[PDB]
């Protein structure tokens, strides 16, 4: 039983919608639950989550559509894991704004 | 026309062994007709004891001659067989039947009875939890057992339940076998790979229905994933 | 002393088809004074034929008996799945009788390759001081199946009694387990535990086995 | 059936994107989707040096014409990121190559 790493891409700085994408690595067991939030709130759409791979170690990608407008009004963008009860979150924001 | 058999379901070895063979509906009158044992160890075939025609002529085996004796009563109506110098070996279950004449020969059978012969006592049975250490192949399903041992007679039933007392079809119960005078016994189930991998039940109970004692322990699934 | 010996011991038979068994005696029965019994696992024996010639009451017209002397043979027209039970051929002119070995009939199918699952010894059994090593086969045919049990490269014997289940009744398959019996001491001394089984089906025979410690 | 010529997206760690032990190593994500035929190729740069080791490129997978997308992941130091790297994904597609560059300058 490993915790699993939490990391979120932001797009760069010099330009790109666009999207964001959670990867949890080093985890045990396979089954993991992600999900995202937008400013405390839950996201009902525009969120999908793709098949469990093989990295013994398992990897899963997450991919979150969004706005340029929304991304310059430093919306708050966080990534829930859940996995052996419990829940890891991270907050990512632009460096540049 | 049918017939009946009783007696002690445990006899300790070196002993007397005492059964009767209850029928009723026919007299031993006419000629021809007559009363003989049958005995079948497990895994074997029938083995001949002894057969007692009218007019008080009985026969024996040479191969057990002067080791058994036959003795009917007509007031009663049922032969009584007696068995000396009991040994391991001999445990089988016992048959009477009736020859309608000097062809028909054991046209009716009756319901036997097992007779064990151990040195041992009728303990409850023991049960031991079974961890599936399969790796690196997670193949069609997985597969948990319950291992009952220390137990005699050899009367068990085997039922698979979930955590939340649900209903499991296994089917899959293996005979008991004679190691070190006491019988031991093997019973295992098929689960789904998917329901592993999902609901939080992380244990199952196995259960033994033994007239000595109603313990059930559970068996923890080793779960891979 | 007359001795019956029946052949083959195992035959597989499809339904609908012709089933001829053999009966062998070790010397002439005088007035051919042989009968068949059928008998059931679970339930008690019951008469077929008697002198080898004339059916009983309650018995379908489909079994027919022929031979004489040293030789007789059981012919079974339209075989049904109910009549896969084991058969006994029994002479009464010998007074003392004397019972053959019987013949098995199963049900002819396809060579189903085998599982192989072992689950090492609970700590709880092994503070009692006996370790049990459990291979289990499910799911194949023939019935007839070599395992055996190499630990530490060196192959074991005389410590496995071997026990098999019935043919199934809805897959007609079979399934036996087989168990390691040793003492704790011993069990202490050795690290890899594995059982070989060999298959008709198999191209190249499968090893299971598992480290100690790490379950 | 037809001929369209790839998207080239990369992704970047932002600034509270690094962890573990010193150095902290991050990852970089280059994604290729609508493009047709299947085929691909994915190379990384990295200041004008080819990349020959640390990275890892997923195999094609399926995402009206067929579509298709790739996704691979180079690993990166975080002092070379500081040091104003510049990070260029290269992709061939039918004889055609197209050029991403990233940077963590405003
Ligand atoms: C007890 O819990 C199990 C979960 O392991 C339940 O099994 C699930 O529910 C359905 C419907 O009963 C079963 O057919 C499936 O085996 C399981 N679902 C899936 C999606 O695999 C089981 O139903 C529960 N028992 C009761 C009585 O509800």
């Known amino acids: 039983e490993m915790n699993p790493n939490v990391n979120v891409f932001v797009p760069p700085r010099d330009g790109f919608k666009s999207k964001l994408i959670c990867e949890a690595t080093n985890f045990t067991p396979k089954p993991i639950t992600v999900s995202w939030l937008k400013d405390g709130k839950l996201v009902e759409s525009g969120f999908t989550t793709d098949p469990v791979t093989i990295e013994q170690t398992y990897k899963v990608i997450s991919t979150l559509t969004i706005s340029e407008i929304d991304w310059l009004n430093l919306n708050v963008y966080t990534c829930r894991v859940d996995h052996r009860g419990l829940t890891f979150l991270k907050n990512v924001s632009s460096t540049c704004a | 026309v049918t017939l009946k058999e009783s007696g002690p379901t445990l006899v300790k070895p070196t002993q007397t062994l005492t059964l009767t063979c209850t029928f009723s509906?026919?007299?031993?009158?006419?000629?021809?007709?007559?009363v003989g044992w049958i005995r079948q160890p497990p895994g074997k075939a029938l083995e001949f004891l002894a057969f007692?025609?009218?007019?008080?002529?009985?026969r024996y085996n040479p191969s057990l001659q002067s080791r058994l004796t036959i003795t009917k009563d007509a007031s009663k109506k049922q032969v009584v067989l007696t068995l000396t110098n009991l040994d391991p070996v001999d445990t089988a279950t016992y048959y009477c039947?009736?020859?309608?004449?000097?062809?028909?020969?054991?046209?009716?059978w009756g319901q036997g009875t097992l007779v064990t012969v151990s040195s041992g006592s009728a303990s409850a049975p023991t049960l031991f939890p079974l961890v599936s250490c399969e790796n690196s192949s997670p193949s069609s399903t997985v597969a948990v057992g319950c291992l009952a041992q220390d137990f005699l007679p050899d009367s068990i039933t085997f039922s698979w339940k979930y955590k939340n007392n649900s209903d499991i079809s296994s089917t899959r119960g293996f005979p008991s076998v004679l190691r070190g005078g006491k019988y031991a016994a093997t019973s295992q189930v098929l689960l789904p790979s998917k329901d592993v991998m999902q609901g939080t039940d992380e244990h199952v109970v196995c259960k033994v229905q033994h007239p000595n004692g109603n313990k059930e322990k559970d068996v923890p699934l080793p779960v891979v994933i | 002393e007359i001795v019956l010996t029946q052949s083959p011991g195992t035959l597989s038979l499809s339904p609908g088809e012709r089933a001829t068994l053999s009966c062998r005696a070790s010397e002439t029965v005088s007035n051919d004074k042989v009968a068949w019994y059928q008998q059931k696992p679970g339930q008690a024996p019951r008469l077929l034929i008697y002198?080898?010639?004339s059916r009983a009451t309650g018995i379908p017209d489909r079994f027919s008996g022929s031979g004489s002397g040293t030789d007789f043979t059981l012919s079974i027209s339209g075989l049904e799945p109910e009549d896969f039970v084991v058969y006994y051929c029994q002479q009464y002119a010998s007074s003392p009788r004397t019972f053959g070995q019987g013949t098995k009939v199963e049900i002819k199918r396809t060579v189903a390759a085998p599982s192989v699952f072992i689950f090492p010894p609970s700590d709880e059994q092994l503070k009692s001081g006996t370790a049990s090593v459990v291979c289990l086969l499910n799911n194949f045919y023939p019935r007839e199946a070599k395992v055996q049990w190499k630990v530490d490269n060196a192959l074991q014997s005389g410590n496995s009694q071997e026990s098999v289940t019935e043919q199934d009744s809805k897959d007609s398959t079979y399934s036996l387990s087989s168990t390691l019996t040793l003492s704790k001491a011993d069990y202490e001394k050795h690290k890899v535990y594995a059982c070989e089984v060999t298959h008709q089906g198999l191209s190249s025979p499968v090893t299971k086995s598992f480290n100690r410690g790490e379950c | 059936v037809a001929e369209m010529n790839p998207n080239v997206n990369v992704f970047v760690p932002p600034r509270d994107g690094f962890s573990g032990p010193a150095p902290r190593k991050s990852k970089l994500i280059c994604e290729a989707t609508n493009f047709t035929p299947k085929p691909i190729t994915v190379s990384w740069l990295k200041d004008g040096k080819l990349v020959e080791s640390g990275f890892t490129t997923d195999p094609v997978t399926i995402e009206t014409p067929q579509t298709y997308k790739v996704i691979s992941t180079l690993t990166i130091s975080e002092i070379d990121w500081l040091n104003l790297n510049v990070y260029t994904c290269r992709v061939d597609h039918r004889g055609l190559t197209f050029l991403k560059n990233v940077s963590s300058t405003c």
């Open positions: 039947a009736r020859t309608s004449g000097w062809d028909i020969e054991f046209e009716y």
């Open positions: 007692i025609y009218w007019n008080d002529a009985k």
């Open positions: 509906g026919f007299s031993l009158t006419t000629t021809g007709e007559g």
């Open positions: 002198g080898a010639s």
